[PDB]
Amino acid sequence: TRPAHAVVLGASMAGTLAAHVLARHVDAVTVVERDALPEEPQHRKGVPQARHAHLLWSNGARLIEEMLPGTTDRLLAAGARRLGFPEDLVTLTGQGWQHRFPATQFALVASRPLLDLTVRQQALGADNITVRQRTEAVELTGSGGGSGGRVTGVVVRDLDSGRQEQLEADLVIDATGRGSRLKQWLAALGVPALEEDVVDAGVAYATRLFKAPPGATTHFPAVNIAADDRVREPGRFGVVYPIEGGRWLATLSCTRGAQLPTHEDEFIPFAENLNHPILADLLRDAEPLTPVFGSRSGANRRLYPERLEQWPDGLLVIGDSLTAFNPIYGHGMSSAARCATTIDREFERSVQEGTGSARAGTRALQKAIGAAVDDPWILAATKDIDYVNCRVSATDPRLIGVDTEQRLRFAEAITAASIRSPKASEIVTDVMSLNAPQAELGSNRFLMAMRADERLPELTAPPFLPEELAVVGLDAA
Ligand SMILES: Cc1cc2nc3c(=O)[nH]c(=O)nc-3n(C[C@H](O)[C@H](O)[C@H](O)COP(=O)(O)OP(=O)(O)OC[C@H]3O[C@@H](n4cnc5c(N)ncnc54)[C@H](O)[C@@H]3O)c2cc1C
Ligand SMILES: [Cl-]
């Protein structure tokens, strides 16, 4: 019959959105979060990735705005910036500088603690949501393996008292992120292993927070620098994003085989060694506020519970626990929002009575969630699969059934069109913002746009406007 109590494990972006949506369809929702959740925008140990630059692409932003009206204005009122693409970015691709065409998509940029707080404030206020902070999910309860498995609840431990308690539930949602213990919980119930795809280019991140030149966060673009991506060499990248409070977040990254800064005096020289040194020129006199923070969470990985015949009833997996991506493409929060939107749109259809058990509904929900995360998976995996020394363990025929040399040729063509042809840039910006599938770049429509559109002359300098150079006090020469 119909769920009366849902338990959500984890209260970051995926779990907070999921709890909001589930409270609309289920009598009572409990949220279990290991951290204390701050009432001010502060970093916390359970989301260490929030130290690094975050873009909320228009796909995720619109889905959050639909679920939680007013959120976008609250973010802008608190200093977030709406960055139009490509218009508001100075971007060097492996094919040249991006012409700054009038924006066709956007992303919201704020410090990740402000985004998270603003969302929580909107989403966890409902009267039928109970948030248990400083509480750790320990294992799942129920039975697994052949025929009739079901999850009936969760063992939780209060971290202040050390006391463990059994939390019964009709539906359990794992939103505990890339560090989820899900595989261990499933093995303990007797559930067989999940199918999983990996495309792991060994990407790593190094980030410093800076005080920006006054006014740069409002009147100076974001800047994104990529390698010429010589076929046999690791990629190296850098981005500088404005966030609230007149600060710049600078995130440097590379793929397997290149070295990232780990000491502060190594940071600007890495940016100096990118294909164009502009990031170093911008940061050279900016005031650093933090040491270098690192991340090694850069692999693309995807679990396929929707394929497991022995998936247990009453269990859903969402967010980074289900699938996680190379952060350079910026889709994890959008993918989290898609998971919650999909639950919202499919919950009633899936749980309609008639089958006599929760199996049909659980499996139908997890199958719809699986379809919803396909776009960020195939985008990021396609972009990473041909890096030198990339580790590929995937069954996806879109990836493993195609000629590598053909894919490389396709990719250069798409990039070359996007930077200098406005009609191509619209379609590519749609895909890069997670609003059209990667498959659209192989369509008749896109190929025709690539062929028929004008192509502007190559840019020979970063396309800053004069008013922008004035802000940071640089000279075109
Ligand atoms: C370097 C880097 C840069 C990124 N940049 C971007 C970007 O630009 N744009 C974007 O959209 N995404 C970006 N991402 C991805 C984004 O951070 C995540 O997709 C997003 O946080 C959603 O993840 P989540 O809610 O599923 O899990 P997480 O955010 O990882 O949170 C999981 C939650 O579960 C809690 N938890 C864990 N274990 C337990 C337990 N046993 N019991 C209870 N609670 C538990 C944790 O404390 C945490 O609150 C980036 C990621 C990284 C690493
Ligand atoms: Cl991290």
Author numbering: 4 to 480
Lines quoted from the article behind this entry:
Monensin A is a prototypical natural polyether polyketide antibiotic. MonCI, a flavin-dependent monooxygenase, is thought to transform all three alkenes in the intermediate polyketide premonensin A into epoxides. MonCI is a class A flavin-dependent monooxygenase based on its structural and biochemical features.
Two molecules of MonCI are present in the crystal asymmetric unit (chain A and B). MonCI consists of a β-strand-rich substrate-binding domain located near the C-terminus and a Rossmann-like three-layer ββα sandwich FAD-binding domain located near the N-terminus. The FAD- and substrate-binding pockets are fused and form a continuous chamber that is shaped like an inverted letter L. The substrate-binding pocket, which lies immediately on top of the isoalloxazine ring of FAD, is about 40 Å long and about 25 Å wide. FAD is bound noncovalently to MonCI through numerous direct and solvent-mediated interactions. The chloride ion coordinates with five hydrogen bond donors (Gln52 main chain nitrogen, Ser298 side chain hydroxyl group, and three water molecules) in a distorted trigonal bipyramidal stereochemistry. In our MonCI crystal structure, the FAD is in the “in” conformation, which is the expected conformation during epoxidation.
